Amino acid sequence: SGPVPSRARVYTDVNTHRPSEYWDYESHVVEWGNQDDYQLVRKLGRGKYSEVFEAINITNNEKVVVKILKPVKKKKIKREIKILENLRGGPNIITLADIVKDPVSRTPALVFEHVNNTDFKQLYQTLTDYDIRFYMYEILKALDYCHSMGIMHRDVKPHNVMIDHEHRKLRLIDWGLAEFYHPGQEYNVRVASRYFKGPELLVDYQMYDYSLDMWSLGCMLASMIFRKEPFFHGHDNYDQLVRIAKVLGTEDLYDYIDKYNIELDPRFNDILGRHSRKRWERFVHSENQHLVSPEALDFLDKLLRYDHQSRLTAREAMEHPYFYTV
Numbered sequence: 001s002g003p004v005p006s007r008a009r010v011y012t013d014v015n016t017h018r019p020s021e022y023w024d025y026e027s028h029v030v031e032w033g034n035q036d037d038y039q040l041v042r043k044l045g046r047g048k049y050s051e052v053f054e055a056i057n058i059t060n061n062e063k064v065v066v067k068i069l070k071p072v073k074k075k076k077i078k079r080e081i082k083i084l085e086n087l088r089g090g091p092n093i094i095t096l097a098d099i100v101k102d103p104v105s106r107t108p109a110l111v112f113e114h115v116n117n118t119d120f121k122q123l124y125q126t127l128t129d130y131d132i133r134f135y136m137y138e139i140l141k142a143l144d145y146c147h148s149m150g151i152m153h154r155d156v157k158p159h160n161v162m163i164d165h166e167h168r169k170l171r172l173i174d175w176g177l178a179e180f181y182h183p184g185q186e187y188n189v190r191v192a193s194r195y196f197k198g199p200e201l202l203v204d205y206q207m208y209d210y211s212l213d214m215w216s217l218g219c220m221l222a223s224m225i226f227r228k229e230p231f232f233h234g235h236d237n238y239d240q241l242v243r244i245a246k247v248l249g250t251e252d253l254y255d256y257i258d259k260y261n262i263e264l265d266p267r268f269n270d271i272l273g274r275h276s277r278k279r280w281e282r283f284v285h286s287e288n289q290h291l292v293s294p295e296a297l298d299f300l301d302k303l304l305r306y307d308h309q310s311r312l313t314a315r316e317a318m319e320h321p322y323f324y325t326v
């Protein structure tokens with residue numbers, strides 16, 4: 001008959017109960033100004049469909065973040081802009097300040113509030129058990145907020161989290177893969193970055209929701225507390241599920257695929273194997289024990305679950321004893 005339908009346990013109908021204008025990005029009218037008002041300072045990053053810069057607004061001598069969009073599908077550009085406008089100002093969300101276009105290139109660019117990012121490959125120097133809890137809570141504020149606004153990020157990873165450690169300022173960025181959640185909609189599973197893909201994407205289960213972001217979050221937490229980047233190190237999309245199965249076990253994987261009546265790809269036949277469920281304590285060592293606690297492990301166990309419905313929602317995660325200290 002096919003896979004069993006599923007829907008989010010929270011914010012299920014938030015979009016259904018709103019007007020067409022809020023979620024119909026294909027019909028949204030994008031109006032941009034002249035890029036002549038901005039001068040590029042330095043490169044911050046580079047993506048598949050973008051290049052991020054530090055820039056100066058010449059009319060007020062204020063630093064900004066400028067994201068130059070590589071002309072991809074116009075609906076994709078429209079989706080991101082609509083999403084950014086809907087979320088503009090939300091807690092720990094990158095704030096869109098302006099939309100422009102260079103007169104000569106006709107290339108569209110997005111202008112954001114300035115964030116002074118501290119180096120990722122040089123942040124763990126003074127990043128304590130408290131720091132991790134504090135920044136994890138800041139990400140959860142962003143997540144409950146965008147989820148409450150009927151949006152799933154679908155690309156949660158360290159590269160999409162900007163941290164200004166001196167001011168304890170965090171921003172969830174790159175809303176280019178984000179999408180409006182509509183219950184029963186079937187989404188393209190070719191989202192998120194390989195190491196952060198939820199089991200739903202890997203088993204080609206299209207009816208996923210907000211909980212996909214909570215699996216990605218769990219991946220980030222595990223790499224941070226265990227000092228193992230990435231935590232699930234797949235070499236391809238099929239191998240990624242094997243790496244998760246080596247930790248969560250194959251019994252609970254079949255239990256999940258049986259629950260939703262998912263049919264596994266033949267590519268999994270020769271590689272999946274048989275694996276027992278491991279204890280989270282197995283990943284503790286001298287180099288990471290100062291960041292691990294029974295609270296951290298309990299919180300992690302409730303995020304990294306095959307069953308997307310069994311994972312904590314962002315609002316439930318904020319109530320976990322791991323955050324009592326913050």
Ligand SMILES: Clc1cc(C[NH2+]CCCc2ccccc2)ccc1-c1ccccc1
Binds near residue numbers: 046157161221224
């Ligand atoms: Cl979420 C995060 C991000 C980081 C650092 N991001 C690097 C972003 C670089 C960049 C890329 C593109 C444009 C602008 C800048 C370091 C640690 C964490 C972290 C904290 C607590 C728990 C787990 C992880």
